[PDB]
Amino acid sequence: SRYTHFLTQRYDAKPQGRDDRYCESIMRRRGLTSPCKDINTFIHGNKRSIKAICENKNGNPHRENLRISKSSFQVTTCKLHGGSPWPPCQYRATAGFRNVVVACENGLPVHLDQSIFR
Template identity: 40%
Template structure:
């Protein structure tokens, strides 16, 4: 009887570990979500260049039917390692880390008052520094951008 309980407990533990492993395999880390929502390197060229934001936000599952349109989103056209490197920079007073150099990016801003798909965006090409918050040495949130000092 005792052996049966031990075997049952062992089986339950194995199943719990298996389920936890599978959940982690299909789950998206905060860093993975950051990459999906904000890094487009090399820059994707769409057939209709003026539709870049709509195309990328839909392709990257940032906007989707049934969800409100995201008011703004920025795509950085630099390698992910350049944004990871920002995490080694000294944080500012608000705790954000900035890239040491300006990088190419596309800033998408929702046009009009439509907050439900289909979403229409205005795109601006910029060369800005990028501010991120980091966890474990990896960027997990794009906190904003700013123009280089002239």
């Protein structure tokens, strides 16, 4: 439930571009444009690795009740451009590659900490 919603909001397995136009498309596809979300980051790659963050084989405890990954992931950060509060929402894409901070419930990721992505 919260896991499927995490994936919806935060996981794109195999993107192609990761350019501005990619962000604008996926923010709409995934229902993050009512209202226009200020910033959102998607994790790429394989799903079992992200699940693994909630175990000891890919995660460490972090701050208050979070977990931070041992391995790095391809990520894309979509940053709202030009103050649109409601659609059409315009976005600027920054691709990166780093470890990720999540929260886990019942051994599955359910929240992504945006703050590590500026």
